[PDB]
Amino acid sequence: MKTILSNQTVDIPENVDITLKGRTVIVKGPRGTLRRDFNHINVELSLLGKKKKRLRVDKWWGNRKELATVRTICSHVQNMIKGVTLGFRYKMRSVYAHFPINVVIQENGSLVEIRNFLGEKYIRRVRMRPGVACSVSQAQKDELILEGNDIELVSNSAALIQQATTVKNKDIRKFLDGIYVSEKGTVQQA
Amino acid sequence: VFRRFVEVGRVAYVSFGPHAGKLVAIVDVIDQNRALVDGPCTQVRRQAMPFKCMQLTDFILKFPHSAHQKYVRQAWQKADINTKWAATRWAKKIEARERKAKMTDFDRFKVMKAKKMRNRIIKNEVKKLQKAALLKASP
Amino acid sequence: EVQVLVLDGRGHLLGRLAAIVAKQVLLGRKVVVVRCEGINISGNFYRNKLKYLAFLRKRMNTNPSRGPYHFRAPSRIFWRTVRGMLPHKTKRGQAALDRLKVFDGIPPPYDKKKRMVVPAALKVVRLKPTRKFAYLGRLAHEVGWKYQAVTATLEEKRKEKAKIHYRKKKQLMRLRKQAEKNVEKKIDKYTEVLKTHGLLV
Amino acid sequence: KASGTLREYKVVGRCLPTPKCHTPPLYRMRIFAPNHVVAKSRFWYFVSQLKKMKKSSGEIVYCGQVFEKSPLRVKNFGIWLRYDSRSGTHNMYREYRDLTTAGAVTQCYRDMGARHRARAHSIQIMKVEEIAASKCRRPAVKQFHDSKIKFPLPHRVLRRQHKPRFTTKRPNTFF
Amino acid sequence: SGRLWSKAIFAGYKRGLRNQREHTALLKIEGVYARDETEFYLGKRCAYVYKAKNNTVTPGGKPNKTRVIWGKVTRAHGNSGMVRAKFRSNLPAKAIGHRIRVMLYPSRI
Amino acid sequence: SHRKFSAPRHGSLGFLPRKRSSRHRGKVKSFPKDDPSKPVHLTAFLGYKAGMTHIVREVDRPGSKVNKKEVVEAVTIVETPPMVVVGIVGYVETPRGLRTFKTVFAEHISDECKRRFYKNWHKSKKKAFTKYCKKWQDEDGKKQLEKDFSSMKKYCQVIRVIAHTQMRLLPLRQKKAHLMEIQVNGGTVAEKLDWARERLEQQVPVNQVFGQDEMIDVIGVTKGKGYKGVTSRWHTKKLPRKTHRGLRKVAC
RNA sequence: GGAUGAACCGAACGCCGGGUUAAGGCGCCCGAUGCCGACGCUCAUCAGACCCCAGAAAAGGUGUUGGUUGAUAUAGACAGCA
RNA sequence: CAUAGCGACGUCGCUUUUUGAUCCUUCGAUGUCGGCUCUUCCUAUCAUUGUGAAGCAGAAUUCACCAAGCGUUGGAUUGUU
RNA sequence: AGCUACCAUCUGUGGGAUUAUGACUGAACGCCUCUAAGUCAGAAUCCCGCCCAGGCGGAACGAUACGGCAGCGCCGCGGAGCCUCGGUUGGCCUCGGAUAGCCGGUCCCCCGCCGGGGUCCGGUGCGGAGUGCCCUUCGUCCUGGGAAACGGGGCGCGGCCGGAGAGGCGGCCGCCCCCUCGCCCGUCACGCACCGCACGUUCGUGGGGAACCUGGCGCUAAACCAUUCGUAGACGACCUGCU
Ligand SMILES: [Mg+2]
Ligand SMILES: [Mg+2]
Ligand SMILES: [Mg+2]
Ligand SMILES: [Mg+2]
Ligand SMILES: [Mg+2]
Ligand SMILES: [Mg+2]
Ligand SMILES: [Mg+2]
Ligand SMILES: [Mg+2]
Ligand SMILES: [Mg+2]
Ligand SMILES: [Mg+2]
Ligand SMILES: [Mg+2]
Ligand SMILES: [Mg+2]
Ligand SMILES: [Mg+2]
Ligand SMILES: [Mg+2]
Ligand SMILES: [Mg+2]
Ligand SMILES: [Mg+2]
Ligand SMILES: [Mg+2]
Ligand SMILES: [Mg+2]
Ligand SMILES: [Mg+2]
Ligand SMILES: [Mg+2]
């Protein structure tokens, strides 16, 4: 069976505009600009709203494998709209048993230094993705705040920090040390 | 993106098959590969036809699906397509292709004489314009 | 034909292109293939890389110097594929192979010459859009080719000189179209003859 | 059995007259075969499984091709059958859209061979019947029941790949 | 003042996979790639022209090193426009992939 | 059947063509990967193995037993007279690799340097570069040379200098100079060309090439030993005395 | 013809020309599909490619497709949000 | 505590590093055990690189995956494997 | 002295795609999910480097033959030829590219008079189209009309530029000499009209090898043996030396 059409329409807020070039989406909002292409997916992109900016994606004659990509793009566009208007803020908590984790933020929040994870003298230097700003919060005792436009880059940057602080040759169930992501919040809370 | 859609009343062009080079109209669609096709004014009775020998044109007719040939014939006659089709670039390109193919040896000779003279005058004018545009000396 | 046929390998399938060319060179037609790094192979990149790595392992255990000479240049990889499709162990096959020349990028013997393309061996038409393919240039680079970097910079130079040549040709074409407007009173007689006989719609 | 372009055959046959039943009852079957030779062969094969008949013990009184009543009307066919898989016999109900009854059975033979690797000698059609759109159950058929149906042809693959075999301009697909 | 003959390529002899009938040969006329196009070239005359070391006669001309082998097209081979040809003497195998002229002498039009 | 006890194989497989070296000088085969940030410097130099001796020095390796102690270390004395640059070669980066774009030599080639081109300096009339050097003074040749320089300045990617060692300073019986291409690193192609131009017909001391307490690599040809048995060529295990056909061989 | 093979498929044999087939084939080697072939299925980080035949099982898959049975759903399914 | 680790009763395979079964090649002869030397290959991985699981607190240990690149000894006894 | 021993001393290396595996975003399945599309980290694995040899594989550069007739090269397409090897029978002098999109053109902005952005105009079964384009060959004599007359043609001179990935190629100036010829439609006749016959028509002054004459510009060398050396070595080969 090949479905004739599996469309899905997203809604663009008026404060942000979208310009389409082929299958490349350009999102221009208050918090910055985001570009992401979708040439790897054979879809038709249409802009319905000259008045309220409805964006429609269409797939013609697709099988069950490729109708899943239709909403996959739609979620990506919603993430782009979310980023350019609210931004993604990730909170990571450093947990430890006896050796307190020491975190030093380098220039512009683009580089993070982890000093005394599990009490070993090795110094971990994890480099964030461009456009992602990390910082030590003043809100709590152990919190790292990662703010950036793209959820792709921010969550990837946070996961790099978490995977770096990985216990080895020990019972990971008992040894609970490591920096873990707590919540996936936003900025400006609008 | 797309502008030409397979739909009831769409006028298609028969590239190949037993009815190649004719205009047809779609009555209904079947099995995502064929359709009910009936062009009455182009001398094509109603029959199934695959989409691989269909090229979508820019003309869509207004009649209900699975209508009889009488309604389609009136829909083809009223708001006629024959005059509209022959005025398009697409038809005359096909028309020019036909007369080029059947151009005779003497007709080939006359064109070559015509092509020889026309190219020389135009190339002379281009040379005239080239030196005309050669009078440029500006900081 | 009697002239030298030149084919651009960009967006072409390896086996599909080689079969058509191998028939041509047996017919006494000189064929030159440029930009062999642009040849695409069906199947995803990792599987294609595994195929060549198995090919690498095939060597004479007694003396690898006499073993299968594993070529790493994209031109040579396409060249070896055509050799398989030809009776290279014969005098006719060697003569057929000598009528074939392969190149990476576009050398100055063919940079100023228009390149033909085989529709029947094109990636865009002989491969379904959702299927995975690999680039011979990237595959050659990851298996041992040492000139992917220089080729890209050299090809960057050629595109720039081609664009300037192209834009000059546009200006001539733009000049011609306006020129045809000026010579209109004395040209319509010959133009109408072409209208009657198909040419110049 | 082989295939091709199947035709519908109305086959009427009965037992030979014997001095117990002077006129044994007549039986009618619809056989889809490439030609009437196969249709008469399959008719004896079918009456044998149902009645206690034989080709030598009976005769066929009529064998005529069945012309479709409305070959210019689009209609949905519901086809009931039985067939032998590699590990058992299964009944099936498949729906296809076609102009003629014979075409629909032809589609079913192609579909069963493609989807279940069933050869024609194992497929055993038992009833073909035209049904209304609202009674159709296959979503593949139901997507065509649209009075305002509209779709484009997105990716027109080039078919004249060897005319010309060599050229200078890459083909276009958008139309 | 003109080519006056159709270009053809001596592809090879008519053959099976493991057998070779050298008395007849297969040709490929340039621009002819379909079986229905070959109808014009059925019955036409084809010749193979080569050169040699010794001088030979020339009908109505000075002796030269030009030699020629005569033949004609009998039927079309396959669907792709290839044709069969019978010559007075079987074509030497060194002529494979070389020009064969189509003389148009038995013109049916 | 497998061998009873697995042992490491004899002899490296990274030097398998165990043949006489086709050269006597020993070619560089790899120059340092040039970067434009560093200033202009040279990379290679030629020396002659005079011999060996040993020294006594203080060790500054903390945590070691010889820290702040006295040790002896064998050292090698290699005579390195200053070189003389006589030519410049620039290379162009082809898709097939590298090829010699153009070579420019200098005037006043030393007599010992000219001996390299002659297999028989005695019977020769010493004719090399006699007509080539005549272009260094005429109107046409100097005009031609500048075009070669600018062409090398706009096309080549790496330039190299040819230098010969002054054999007259050395006490060897050999009077024939040794020529070697030396890559010029550290800068733009234009700047290194200008520097190579200013060092033509000049003497390059080793101090301008190397420095104190730095690590370098040595390229050369080992001592010839002639035909040798497998026991010495590959350091295989000897066979016992009871062997019939001899014991300095390989059994299987 | 089955790449190759005493038995398999076809077909048995004086020397030749023409035409037509069998079994099998028609991307290249290599003769033939350089048909605008038809319908679908299938992505394999050891795919698959034809009697003999030259290599695989039981058992699993929420990969995908078809079909059977049963059930729920505008007297509102299912899922998410207390 | 079925499945951390084991798998009775049953059941389907794989390997040709054993011993069987057969006698197709060799009887106008292919040198028959074992040891020494020496090279290569395989993985059903003993150790080493990187991982998952454990009734993995650490340490020690077991199972499993990618994996054959490197390494896998010196001796008494016996011709011995 | 030479050879020589973990029996003494020295030295032994960087990168990439990635497996297993751990993850990101995210559907399928308005939930979840490492996976379907798309991303990340990742190794004694693999490959490359470093190192070893260097193709019936290329590059650049030098010097290129006597003091006596003595060879040779370059320039002449200079002439007359001899022998051999054969193919061929108009050219295209070029964008990048995508295919669920393109192509061309135009107005405003910034990029140093031209590119690239955005409005606009057109085309899209490609017609500013390789199913295409250009040249197109019987030749001359009267003979008019249109095209031109800022024109063409010089194996005619000197100069300039571009092209280096294999540039061996392309373009442009200034001077001199020819025709006012060639392009099309017309007028006017002529040519061996060789009496039906094939290899005709082209590249083409084809390529290669001697060799005669003929002008100018020219150059006057190495290799190998023998000998010597021993950084080398079975012999060869290799490193060397010789008013
Ligand atoms: Mg532990
Ligand atoms: Mg072992
Ligand atoms: Mg003995
Ligand atoms: Mg056979
Ligand atoms: Mg077989
Ligand atoms: Mg026969
Ligand atoms: Mg075959
Ligand atoms: Mg063929
Ligand atoms: Mg026996
Ligand atoms: Mg014997
Ligand atoms: Mg013996
Ligand atoms: Mg033996
Ligand atoms: Mg394993
Ligand atoms: Mg090894
Ligand atoms: Mg002992
Ligand atoms: Mg003892
Ligand atoms: Mg030692
Ligand atoms: Mg979610
Ligand atoms: Mg994974
Ligand atoms: Mg990575």
Coordinates of N, CA, C and O (backbone and C1' of nucleotides) and ligand atoms in Angstrom, one line a residue, chain I residues 19-23 34-35 40-41, ligand 19:
Chain I
rU19 P 30.8 2.3 13.2 O5' 31.6 1.0 13.6 C5' 31.6 -0.1 12.6 C4' 32.1 -1.4 13.3 C3' 31.4 -1.8 14.5 O3' 30.1 -2.4 14.3 C1' 33.7 -2.1 14.8
rA20 P 28.8 -2.1 15.2 O5' 29.3 -2.7 16.6 C5' 29.4 -4.1 16.8 C4' 30.1 -4.4 18.1 C3' 29.4 -3.8 19.4 O3' 28.4 -4.7 19.8 C1' 31.8 -3.5 19.4
rU21 P 26.9 -4.0 20.2 O5' 27.3 -2.9 21.3 C5' 27.7 -3.2 22.6 C4' 28.4 -2.0 23.2 C3' 27.5 -0.8 23.5 O3' 26.7 -1.0 24.7 C1' 29.6 -0.1 22.6
rG22 P 25.2 -0.3 24.7 O5' 25.5 1.1 25.3 C5' 26.2 1.3 26.4 C4' 26.7 2.7 26.6 C3' 25.7 3.8 26.3 O3' 24.9 4.1 27.5 C1' 27.6 4.3 25.1
rA23 P 23.4 4.6 27.3 O5' 23.4 5.4 25.9 C5' 22.5 6.5 25.8 C4' 23.3 7.8 25.4 C3' 22.5 8.8 24.6 O3' 21.7 9.6 25.4 C1' 24.6 8.4 23.6
rC34 P 17.1 6.3 23.5 O5' 18.2 6.4 22.3 C5' 17.9 7.1 21.1 C4' 18.6 6.5 19.9 C3' 18.2 5.1 19.6 O3' 17.0 5.0 18.9 C1' 20.5 5.2 19.6
rU35 P 16.3 3.6 18.5 O5' 16.8 3.2 17.1 C5' 16.1 2.4 16.2 C4' 16.5 2.6 14.7 C3' 17.9 2.4 14.5 O3' 18.1 1.9 13.1 C1' 17.3 4.6 13.9
rC40 P 28.8 13.7 13.1 O5' 29.1 13.5 14.7 C5' 29.0 14.6 15.6 C4' 29.1 14.2 17.0 C3' 30.3 13.3 17.3 O3' 31.5 14.0 17.4 C1' 28.3 12.5 18.4
rA41 P 32.9 13.2 17.0 O5' 33.2 12.2 18.3 C5' 33.4 12.8 19.5 C4' 33.5 11.7 20.6 C3' 34.4 10.5 20.3 O3' 35.7 10.8 20.6 C1' 32.3 9.8 21.1
Ligands
MG19 MG 24.1 1.5 17.4

